[PDB]
Amino acid sequence: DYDLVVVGGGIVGAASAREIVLRHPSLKVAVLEKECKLAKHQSGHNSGVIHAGIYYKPGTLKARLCVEGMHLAYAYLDEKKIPYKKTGKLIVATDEKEVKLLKDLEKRGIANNVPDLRMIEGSEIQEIEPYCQGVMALHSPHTGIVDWGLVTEHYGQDFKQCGGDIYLDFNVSTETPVTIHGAKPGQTVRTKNVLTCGGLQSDLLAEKTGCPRDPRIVPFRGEYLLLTKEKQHMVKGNIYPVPDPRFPFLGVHFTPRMDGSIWLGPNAVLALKREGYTWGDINLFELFDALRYPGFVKMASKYIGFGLSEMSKSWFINLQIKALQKYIPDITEYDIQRGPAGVRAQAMDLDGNLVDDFVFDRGLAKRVLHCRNAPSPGATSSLAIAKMIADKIENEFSIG
Amino acid sequence: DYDLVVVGGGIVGAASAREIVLRHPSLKVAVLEKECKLAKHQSGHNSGVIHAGIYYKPGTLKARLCVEGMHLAYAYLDEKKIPYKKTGKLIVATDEKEVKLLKDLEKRGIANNVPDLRMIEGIQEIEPYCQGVMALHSPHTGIVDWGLVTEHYGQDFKQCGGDIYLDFNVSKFTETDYPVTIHGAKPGQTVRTKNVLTCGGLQSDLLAEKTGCPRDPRIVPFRGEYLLLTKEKQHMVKGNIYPVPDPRFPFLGVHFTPRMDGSIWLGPNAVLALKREGYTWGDINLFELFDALRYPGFVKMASKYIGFGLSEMSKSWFINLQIKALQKYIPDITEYDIQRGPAGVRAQAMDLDGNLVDDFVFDRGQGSGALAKRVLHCRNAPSPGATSSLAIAKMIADKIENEFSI
Amino acid sequence: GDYDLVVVGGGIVGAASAREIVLRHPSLKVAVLEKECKLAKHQSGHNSGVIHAGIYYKPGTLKARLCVEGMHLAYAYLDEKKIPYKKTGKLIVATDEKEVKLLKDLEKRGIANNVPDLRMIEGSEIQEIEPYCQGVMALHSPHTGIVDWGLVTEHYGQDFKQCGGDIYLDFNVSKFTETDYPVTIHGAKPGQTVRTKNVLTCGGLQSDLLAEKTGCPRDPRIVPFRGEYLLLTKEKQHMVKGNIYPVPDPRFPFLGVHFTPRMDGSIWLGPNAVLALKREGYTWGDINLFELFDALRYPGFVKMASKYIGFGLSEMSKSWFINLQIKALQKYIPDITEYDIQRGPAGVRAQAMDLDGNLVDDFVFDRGQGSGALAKRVLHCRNAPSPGATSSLAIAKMIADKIENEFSIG
Amino acid sequence: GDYDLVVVGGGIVGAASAREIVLRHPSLKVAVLEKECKLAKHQSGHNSGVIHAGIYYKPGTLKARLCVEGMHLAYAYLDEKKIPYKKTGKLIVATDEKEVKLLKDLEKRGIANNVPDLRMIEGSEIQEIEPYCQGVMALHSPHTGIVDWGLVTEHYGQDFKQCGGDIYLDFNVSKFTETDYPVTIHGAKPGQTVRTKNVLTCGGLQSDLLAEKTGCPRDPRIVPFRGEYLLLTKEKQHMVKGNIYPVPDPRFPFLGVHFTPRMDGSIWLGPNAVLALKREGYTWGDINLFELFDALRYPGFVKMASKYIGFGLSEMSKSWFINLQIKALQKYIPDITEYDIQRGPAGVRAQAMDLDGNLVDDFVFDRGQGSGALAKRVLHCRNAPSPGATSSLAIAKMIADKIENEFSI
Numbered sequence A: 001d002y003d004l005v006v007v008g009g010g011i012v013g014a015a016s017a018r019e020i021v022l023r024h025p026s027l028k029v030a031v032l033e034k035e036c037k038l039a040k041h042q043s044g045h046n047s048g049v050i051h052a053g054i055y056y057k058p059g060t061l062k063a064r065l066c067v068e069g070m071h072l073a074y075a076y077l078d079e080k081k082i083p084y085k086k087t088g089k090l091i092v093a094t095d096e097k098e099v100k101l102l103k104d105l106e107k108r109g110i111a112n113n114v115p116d117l118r119m120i121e122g123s124e125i126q127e128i129e130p131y132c133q134g135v136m137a138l139h140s141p142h143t144g145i146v147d148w149g150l151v152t153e154h155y156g157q158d159f160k161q162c163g164g165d166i167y168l169d170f171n172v173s174t175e176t177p178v179t180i181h182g183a184k185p186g187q188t189v190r191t192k193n194v195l196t197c198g199g200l201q202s203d204l205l206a207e208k209t210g211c212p213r214d215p216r217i218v219p220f221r222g223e224y225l226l227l228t229k230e231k232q233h234m235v236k237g238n239i240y241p242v243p244d245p246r247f248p249f250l251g252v253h254f255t256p257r258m259d260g261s262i263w264l265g266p267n268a269v270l271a272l273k274r275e276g277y278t279w280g281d282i283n284l285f286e287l288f289d290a291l292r293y294p295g296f297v298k299m300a301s302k303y304i305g306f307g308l309s310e311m312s313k314s315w316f317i318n319l320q321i322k323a324l325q326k327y328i329p330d331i332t333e334y335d336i337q338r339g340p341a342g343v344r345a346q347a348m349d350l351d352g353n354l355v356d357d358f359v360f361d362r363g364l365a366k367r368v369l370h371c372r373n374a375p376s377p378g379a380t381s382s383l384a385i386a387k388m389i390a391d392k393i394e395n396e397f398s399i400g
Numbered sequence B: 001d002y003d004l005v006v007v008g009g010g011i012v013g014a015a016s017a018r019e020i021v022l023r024h025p026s027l028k029v030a031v032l033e034k035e036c037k038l039a040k041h042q043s044g045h046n047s048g049v050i051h052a053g054i055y056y057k058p059g060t061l062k063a064r065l066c067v068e069g070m071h072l073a074y075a076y077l078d079e080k081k082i083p084y085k086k087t088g089k090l091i092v093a094t095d096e097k098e099v100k101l102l103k104d105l106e107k108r109g110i111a112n113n114v115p116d117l118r119m120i121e122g123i124q125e126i127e128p129y130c131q132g133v134m135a136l137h138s139p140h141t142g143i144v145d146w147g148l149v150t151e152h153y154g155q156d157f158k159q160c161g162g163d164i165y166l167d168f169n170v171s172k173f174t175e176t177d178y179p180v181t182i183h184g185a186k187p188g189q190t191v192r193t194k195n196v197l198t199c200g201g202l203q204s205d206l207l208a209e210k211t212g213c214p215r216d217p218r219i220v221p222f223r224g225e226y227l228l229l230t231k232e233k234q235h236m237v238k239g240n241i242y243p244v245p246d247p248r249f250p251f252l253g254v255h256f257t258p259r260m261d262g263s264i265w266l267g268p269n270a271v272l273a274l275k276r277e278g279y280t281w282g283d284i285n286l287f288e289l290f291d292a293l294r295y296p297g298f299v300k301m302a303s304k305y306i307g308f309g310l311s312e313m314s315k316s317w318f319i320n321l322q323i324k325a326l327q328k329y330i331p332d333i334t335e336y337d338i339q340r341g342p343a344g345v346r347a348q349a350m351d352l353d354g355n356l357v358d359d360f361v362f363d364r365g366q367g368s369g370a371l372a373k374r375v376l377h378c379r380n381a382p383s384p385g386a387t388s389s390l391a392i393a394k395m396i397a398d399k400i401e402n403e404f405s406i
Numbered sequence C: 001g002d003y004d005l006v007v008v009g010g011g012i013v014g015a016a017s018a019r020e021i022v023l024r025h026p027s028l029k030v031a032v033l034e035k036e037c038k039l040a041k042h043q044s045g046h047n048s049g050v051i052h053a054g055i056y057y058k059p060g061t062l063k064a065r066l067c068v069e070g071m072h073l074a075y076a077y078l079d080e081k082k083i084p085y086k087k088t089g090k091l092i093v094a095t096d097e098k099e100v101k102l103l104k105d106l107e108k109r110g111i112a113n114n115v116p117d118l119r120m121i122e123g124s125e126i127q128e129i130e131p132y133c134q135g136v137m138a139l140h141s142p143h144t145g146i147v148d149w150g151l152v153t154e155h156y157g158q159d160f161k162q163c164g165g166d167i168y169l170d171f172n173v174s175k176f177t178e179t180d181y182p183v184t185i186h187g188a189k190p191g192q193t194v195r196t197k198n199v200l201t202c203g204g205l206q207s208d209l210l211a212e213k214t215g216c217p218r219d220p221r222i223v224p225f226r227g228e229y230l231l232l233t234k235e236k237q238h239m240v241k242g243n244i245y246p247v248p249d250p251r252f253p254f255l256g257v258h259f260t261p262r263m264d265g266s267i268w269l270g271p272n273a274v275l276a277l278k279r280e281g282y283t284w285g286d287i288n289l290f291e292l293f294d295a296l297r298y299p300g301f302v303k304m305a306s307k308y309i310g311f312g313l314s315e316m317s318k319s320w321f322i323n324l325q326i327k328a329l330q331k332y333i334p335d336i337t338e339y340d341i342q343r344g345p346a347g348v349r350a351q352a353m354d355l356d357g358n359l360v361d362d363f364v365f366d367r368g369q370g371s372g373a374l375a376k377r378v379l380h381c382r383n384a385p386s387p388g389a390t391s392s393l394a395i396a397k398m399i400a401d402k403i404e405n406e407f408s409i410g
Numbered sequence D: 001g002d003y004d005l006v007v008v009g010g011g012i013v014g015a016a017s018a019r020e021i022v023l024r025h026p027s028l029k030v031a032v033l034e035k036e037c038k039l040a041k042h043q044s045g046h047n048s049g050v051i052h053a054g055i056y057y058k059p060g061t062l063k064a065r066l067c068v069e070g071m072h073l074a075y076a077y078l079d080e081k082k083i084p085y086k087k088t089g090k091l092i093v094a095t096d097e098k099e100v101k102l103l104k105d106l107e108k109r110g111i112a113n114n115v116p117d118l119r120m121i122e123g124s125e126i127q128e129i130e131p132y133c134q135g136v137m138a139l140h141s142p143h144t145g146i147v148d149w150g151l152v153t154e155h156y157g158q159d160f161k162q163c164g165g166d167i168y169l170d171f172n173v174s175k176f177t178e179t180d181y182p183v184t185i186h187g188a189k190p191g192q193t194v195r196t197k198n199v200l201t202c203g204g205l206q207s208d209l210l211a212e213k214t215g216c217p218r219d220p221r222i223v224p225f226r227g228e229y230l231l232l233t234k235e236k237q238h239m240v241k242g243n244i245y246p247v248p249d250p251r252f253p254f255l256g257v258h259f260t261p262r263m264d265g266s267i268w269l270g271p272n273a274v275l276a277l278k279r280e281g282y283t284w285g286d287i288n289l290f291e292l293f294d295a296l297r298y299p300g301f302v303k304m305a306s307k308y309i310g311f312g313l314s315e316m317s318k319s320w321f322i323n324l325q326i327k328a329l330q331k332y333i334p335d336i337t338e339y340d341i342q343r344g345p346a347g348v349r350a351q352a353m354d355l356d357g358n359l360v361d362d363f364v365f366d367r368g369q370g371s372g373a374l375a376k377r378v379l380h381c382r383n384a385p386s387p388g389a390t391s392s393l394a395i396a397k398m399i400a401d402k403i404e405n406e407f408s409i
């Protein structure tokens, strides 16, 4: 029926499908998404921050797309007149031990070409955020916030305007040259090749492939806390902490929203379910397969204490606010409301390392391909990652 | 925006909305559904059998709606030309004890006048691969895609001017000629209307508490797992083969029915689900788990029928036990001929005394406010809601006309 | 250097085994190690205390011969040592026609095993023996009785000590090491040491765990089956005069929840067959996670659960809600209710299971592989045929015969 | 009728209290009821075996005065009875500058508590006492010794029996009833009974459960904390000559995992502070649903967990994966790897907790609320100040003073 299929209606699957039709406006392309609308998971439950690229090492690949995709974003945001707001980000350090890591963030940032990286300290901290403390802080006024779920549906609007079709409520679940079946009998779409970009199910899409199970996706939920509208003037822009460089998580941070709300998060607690957006939502066969994975216990043998304290502050938010008072001490417990959350698609190898790079796997064979992982931030680098994915398309599939 | 809104895109929520607009084309009616499509839960995960009424006591409203629903169904299926197959229904009895419970069903079935029962003894001509000692021949029974006819209910509802709101998860009722306002999960998605009706099925109790209705009764999920008979032995079952069920429970037991595509599926069973929408065994929700266990009526029913609940659970853990039970009817089926298939969840209502509620349950908030008196909740409907959909719709329409003055 | 033979186990099996071996060989220096404070602290001290006559067992096997011979040896032992006992009758009652056909099989097995002296009593003559019990047909056995089997174990140790034997209490055997006496036994306490030539273990609930400390395989495995009891209050103690047993399923060694009087006049209801979540799990709450991750990971557990999990869940369900247990007992005594019962103490069965899932009921002797010192000289009795209390003296003669053959004792 | 006063509890506190009450009153028929088979089979028999000098305790308090006097009273008792002991000397190391400020606060407290020959040393002088141990600064208490408190507990019992006292072993107290001897104590066995006039219970892990039998409130409830130890191999035992303690968090009574030699020459690593899912839960898998459901339904449990859940989870994490435990130990002696240790025995702490969630470290005497014979003649010592073993002789004299005023003896 078609010539190319992109399984997954996320910001990665939409930007990759939008990029490949502007390349060649000749192929009949389709997008398969199991939910009603696009950006219903990771790209719909993110912090909304347009990252600049500070934590990443110079000369890396992750820092290449992050600085590029951020520039490609602001270009696409003005092209489509997408509402955005350049708020700026202050990476505040409390102890001197965080300052030593904060200077490593500045040294790694000057080489990634981040616009207007300034290291402030002292009374110059409150001139940008008047309610935040700290000893030293790193300023990046080029960072902004935007509705990434709104940019994702704008990617599909462009994709649909170029002869593309977005098959929604299509939950994939066969050579006829390939035919993709679904949950409803009779729901089948035939095409030449297929590219799968599932979020927390990219590992399960490998089984249809014939790919090896690894790297398995480990769900890490990121809970957000809503600050009451009474005292939201206390947060003007992004207020990030200095995280542990051993983990890709950046820590619970103060970030404004487009509607004026101030969400505090996200955290990094292990989810008992792939799509486990709530604590009580537990799937037995989805964690027994996650805990029997050889790479989990390896990482658990070294980082269990860091995961337990994330869940301890999640069970008792009085401990969470106590840590947040290091930055804004004028925040009480009666000002906090438990809001929604998102779950990360954390890839992991059998050695216990959270996968950092691109992961493309193929078994059906050769005709399929699974972007099982992409460098983060996937939302900021979306258009940049969409190019690198599109350049892996014409090679294996022989396109154009 | 509208004058009446039916919360729930199930088969009884779409049939009630279809009936209320055909009776009153002067009314702007809307339908709010949280899923993407209509009939996504109970109406889309059922055995598909067009029941005729046998297990139901004569003179009961439950027995009257099923005999009225089956004639309205075949008439509606012929009106829209929806594919259906009228298969036989043999209620086979094995032991002599099942016979004493069975000849009650015949006299109970003929009393409600179902055309046309025939007591058989000595079954290889309606079902050659089946066994037993005595059964009932119900040729008027049939299979159907209840999920497909539910979309036809919504198609008729949209043809007459009604709007179907999909991906609309009712989260909050508020006060605003349209006093009540319904809120969705997405910010900004709101609908103002005059009066509200909720047919949330599995969330009928949860939706009722948002208006002011008590926790009584509560919806207790009972999963109905199905086993798919392999393609090499689909010829062993021609029509529906039902067992002789225990009258103390509304469940009809694991039975043999073909689907519209010719596939023979074995089920469903009756097992407590640890989640309202727990279609799989691993998927459990703690707050919904403890909501069912902390209910006063749960421990009361468990104090008298836990052996039967653990009976179905043990047969679900080890399917070889389920095979030994199904071999009483067709002994030519082994563990190598079945596979794990899909399932459905029953929206079983339970009172504070542990009794599974069966009759109609309409409830509204206490007082004379806006959210009260204007929002009526249908917390339960007599089974089978799929077959009796058109008959229940006429019953619900009369309740809406009486409660909301139309 | 200490003893010639050491018996690890203070129960009725190990005590009778040590008593029998010293009576046959007065020159032997034999010792007994018990991990608890006193003899008969577990199975032998938490039982129904009924002296079985040997009805349920098939004719021709050894268990049928051991129970009847052990019962005769018991009454002569109780009369010799002046031990109190009441020869209360046993009445196996059937309530429906299905249990009648199976009770007829119990009559043929009882008359072939020569149990004195059964009679098939009709439903009209049931109250002539039990004026409150109902039923359609029953099987009477007037020569069974009740006795404090825990007290009989103390008498076995008293005879063992009066022949020169030593009983080491509070001695928890933990490891065997090589040393005239090349076997050294170590306790849990530092310095607890006993040198011996040959060891015989009757660990009961830990028979499999003791065997693995020598070189024996994990099979057979000891699966704990707790037997809970109920206390019928005094206000209705007169409704039961003797023993009222139900007609059990022949597929299981469990005899079912029965009415049994005690030596103090009490009436106990039980025991049931509840899977204990602990080797010594006498209560419903005490769980040992490691004893679960090994009892379920055993290849034979799921094989038995695949066929009889509904039977075990039935016993657990009637324990969670005793109103279901009351209705079952009302088939026999229909005028007791939930206000007349109290939860009492329980016992845990040392149920031996093979790799195929079948509950073993024969003699299982095991020793380490090879020709080492820990092997050959340490023989483990993994299982003894039930009832261990009634067949105690009979099993003791056969264990002593096995010890003489295995250890070359003059 | 039988005795004048009985002492429920075979531990070192119950034995020393019964020993003290009969030395001051030789005409008092006193008995001791112990549910186990031997004396000191729980806390008094599964401890670190250290004779504390009195460092971490606040000066001027009762807890600081009992340990200092009890240490001198014990050393005099051991020399009198010729009980073997070794003075190894404690050494508290600070690894970073954050712990050195806490270490100096321990110095000031130790000086005020009159700890003999306490000196503060640092990097150059620590290898002079412990060559294999690293660190920034150290607090050297050379008079801290080790002893077998289980052997000392039995020496208390033989002294209690020399003066006419009776020790009832395998006596599981299960029920108190009314009858010159008005109160009757019931055992777990039938007919196992004893009568007396007054009762003093030192149940340790069952301090509260014994008090509930005579009408006392549920508070304070005993919360079980397991103290796990690790056995260092005999090869590397020469690398630890004396006691090596870390700088503990002053917010908790726990002293942390420490290096400690024993009488037989073994070097044990511990104890830790993991929450036991069973009151007598000496192993990881030993749980009890009844003893746990009531442990969670206690109002103070959620409060204490609401503020210190991470400290307890970190201890459990270092016990689940011992590679994290040896890493924390390599901050002191880095030559010890995972191949040098193996899981050993453990002990359970009878930690008392109030309704607000604070770990009570003071005396808690309780009696029945009514005015009957049970509610006025059974005094329950629901908690004793830490440490119980070192302060054994000092606590016994004040417990004897309490029962002398409570019962007018």
Ligand SMILES: Cc1cc2nc3c(=O)[nH]c(=O)nc-3n(C[C@H](O)[C@H](O)[C@H](O)COP(=O)(O)OP(=O)(O)OC[C@H]3O[C@@H](n4cnc5c(N)ncnc54)[C@H](O)[C@@H]3O)c2cc1C
Pocket: A007, A008, A009, A010, A011, A012, A013, A032, A033, A034, A035, A038, A039, A040, A041, A042, A043, A044, A045, A046, A047, A048, A049, A050, A051, A148, A170, A171, A172, A173, A197, A198, A199, A200, A201, A202, A222, A266, A342, A343, A344, A345, A376, A377, A378, A379, A380, A381
């Ligand atoms: C908590 C959180 C906060 C974040 N904050 C930021 C931030 O501030 N800035 C930033 O730049 N990035 C941020 N990110 C990163 C960014 O949001 C994600 O990395 C990005 O959305 C990844 O795109 P994706 O399409 O792979 O994920 P997804 O959005 O999950 O896309 C996958 C899609 O595949 C579909 N799918 C899955 N399985 C199937 C199937 N079987 N059949 C059909 N469809 C299927 C799903 O419905 C889904 O829509 C954040 C991520 C998280 C988790």
Ligand SMILES: Cc1cc2nc3c(=O)[nH]c(=O)nc-3n(C[C@H](O)[C@H](O)[C@H](O)COP(=O)(O)OP(=O)(O)OC[C@H]3O[C@@H](n4cnc5c(N)ncnc54)[C@H](O)[C@@H]3O)c2cc1C
Pocket: B007, B008, B009, B010, B011, B012, B013, B032, B033, B034, B035, B038, B039, B040, B041, B042, B043, B044, B045, B046, B047, B048, B049, B050, B051, B168, B169, B170, B171, B199, B200, B201, B202, B203, B207, B223, B224, B268, B343, B344, B345, B346, B347, B383, B384, B385, B386, B387, B388
């Ligand atoms: C296993 C099984 C087999 C069956 N087999 C048969 C058979 O053979 N024959 C027969 O006649 N009957 C059968 N039935 C009965 C029949 O399927 C049901 O009784 C009937 O579908 C119930 O109608 P309903 O509209 O409540 O269903 P549902 O589809 O469950 O209606 C509930 C609807 O409300 C929606 N909703 C819930 N909460 C909200 C909210 N907050 N906002 C918006 N929408 C919401 C849900 O998404 C759902 O679409 C079977 C039932 C089961 C469980």
Ligand SMILES: Cc1cc2nc3c(=O)[nH]c(=O)nc-3n(C[C@H](O)[C@H](O)[C@H](O)COP(=O)(O)OP(=O)(O)OC[C@H]3O[C@@H](n4cnc5c(N)ncnc54)[C@H](O)[C@@H]3O)c2cc1C
Pocket: C008, C009, C010, C011, C012, C013, C014, C033, C034, C035, C036, C039, C040, C041, C042, C043, C044, C045, C046, C047, C048, C049, C050, C051, C052, C149, C171, C172, C173, C174, C202, C203, C204, C205, C206, C210, C227, C271, C346, C347, C348, C349, C350, C386, C387, C388, C389, C390, C391
């Ligand atoms: C609930 C129940 C009811 C019963 N009712 C009856 C009845 O009515 N009539 C009848 O005839 N029979 C009855 N029996 C059977 C009888 O009670 C037992 O079969 C018999 O007691 C088994 O003897 P034993 O010594 O092997 O058991 P146990 O007494 O359990 O023997 C094990 C002993 O070894 C010790 N031990 C274990 N490991 C070690 C170690 N490492 N070191 C040292 N010591 C150790 C234990 O402390 C214990 O003392 C009943 C059994 C049960 C469980």
Ligand SMILES: Cc1cc2nc3c(=O)[nH]c(=O)nc-3n(C[C@H](O)[C@H](O)[C@H](O)COP(=O)(O)OP(=O)(O)OC[C@H]3O[C@@H](n4cnc5c(N)ncnc54)[C@H](O)[C@@H]3O)c2cc1C
Pocket: D008, D009, D010, D011, D012, D013, D014, D015, D033, D034, D035, D036, D039, D040, D041, D042, D043, D044, D045, D046, D047, D048, D049, D050, D051, D052, D171, D172, D173, D174, D202, D203, D204, D205, D206, D210, D226, D227, D271, D346, D347, D348, D349, D350, D387, D388, D389, D390, D391
């Ligand atoms: C791991 C650990 C390490 C320690 N290390 C040290 C150290 O280095 N130095 C130091 O000075 N202190 C130390 N201590 C403290 C000291 O060991 C204890 O505080 C001390 O044993 C308390 O005395 P006790 O009698 O209450 O103890 P316990 O021995 O626990 O006293 C309770 C006694 O009462 C009995 N009992 C309970 N209920 C009943 C009943 N119903 N009927 C009859 N008897 C009953 C018990 O069997 C037990 O014998 C340590 C404690 C622990 C847990």
Ligand SMILES: CCCCCCCCCCCCO[C@@H]1O[C@H](CO)[C@@H](O[C@H]2O[C@H](CO)[C@@H](O)[C@H](O)[C@H]2O)[C@H](O)[C@H]1O
Pocket: A241, A242, A243, A244, A247, A249, A250, A251, A252, A253, A267, A268, A270, A296, A299, A300, A303, A304, A305, A306, A307, A308, A310, A323, A324, A326
């Ligand atoms: C395998 C079983 C589960 C183990 C899982 C391992 C996951 C590891 C998660 C790493 C933690 C998440 O990321 C972690 O976030 C915390 C909390 O914001 C940051 O913490 C930092 O910022 C917070 C503010 O939020 C300050 O209060 C805090 O003092 C400071 O340390 C850490 O610097 C960062 O490392």
Ligand SMILES: CCCCCCCCCCCCO[C@@H]1O[C@H](CO)[C@@H](O[C@H]2O[C@H](CO)[C@@H](O)[C@H](O)[C@H]2O)[C@H](O)[C@H]1O
Pocket: B243, B244, B245, B246, B249, B251, B252, B253, B254, B255, B269, B270, B272, B301, B302, B305, B306, B308, B309, B310, B312, B325, B326, B328
């Ligand atoms: C844990 C708490 C559980 C709460 C308990 C409430 C749930 C109780 C469920 C009982 C109802 C299940 O429904 C029950 O299905 C079984 C199995 O199909 C039927 O059983 C019948 O058919 C089966 C085959 O299908 C035959 O093997 C069987 O001999 C016959 O009785 C029963 O007649 C019916 O009563």
Ligand SMILES: CCCCCCCCCCCCO[C@@H]1O[C@H](CO)[C@@H](O[C@H]2O[C@H](CO)[C@@H](O)[C@H](O)[C@H]2O)[C@H](O)[C@H]1O
Pocket: C246, C247, C248, C249, C252, C254, C255, C256, C257, C258, C271, C272, C273, C275, C301, C304, C305, C308, C309, C311, C312, C313, C315, C328, C329, C331
């Ligand atoms: C590891 C797998 C799970 C455990 C495996 C199964 C172990 C348990 C086997 C069944 C338990 C023992 O089974 C025992 O005998 C039968 C059932 O067989 C019952 O026997 C009797 O029960 C009651 C009387 O008390 C009567 O109403 C009943 O008709 C009759 O059968 C006993 O009450 C029961 O105690």
Ligand SMILES: CCCCCCCCCCCCO[C@@H]1O[C@H](CO)[C@@H](O[C@H]2O[C@H](CO)[C@@H](O)[C@H](O)[C@H]2O)[C@H](O)[C@H]1O
Pocket: D246, D247, D248, D249, D252, D254, D255, D256, D257, D258, D272, D273, D275, D301, D304, D305, D308, D309, D310, D311, D312, D313, D315, D328, D329, D331
């Ligand atoms: C009821 C649920 C709530 C959980 C209950 C809370 C329990 C609190 C337990 C406190 C922790 C135990 O006590 C704690 O031991 C650790 C580890 O030895 C000590 O830690 C110290 O010593 C260790 C090694 O011994 C060093 O590696 C470490 O850097 C240093 O801080 C802490 O200083 C002490 O505070």
Ligand SMILES: O=C(O)CCC(=O)C(=O)O
Pocket: A046, A047, A049, A051, A222, A248, A249, A250, A251, A265, A266, A344, A377
């Ligand atoms: O898990 C993370 O910290 C990465 C998500 C992110 O980019 C953010 O929230 O700012």
Ligand SMILES: O=C(O)CCC(=O)C(=O)O
Pocket: B047, B049, B051, B250, B251, B252, B253, B267, B268, B346, B383, B384
């Ligand atoms: O057994 C039930 O619960 C009713 C479902 C039904 O109607 C059927 O499967 O035929």
Ligand SMILES: O=C(O)CCC(=O)C(=O)O
Pocket: C047, C048, C049, C050, C253, C254, C255, C256, C270, C271, C349, C387
């Ligand atoms: O029923 C059992 O499991 C055997 C126990 C026994 O011998 C009895 O209670 O009589």
Ligand SMILES: O=C(O)CCC(=O)C(=O)O
Pocket: D047, D048, D050, D052, D227, D253, D254, D255, D256, D270, D271, D349, D387
């Ligand atoms: O719990 C503790 O750490 C205190 C017990 C003690 O004195 C020790 O182990 O040194």
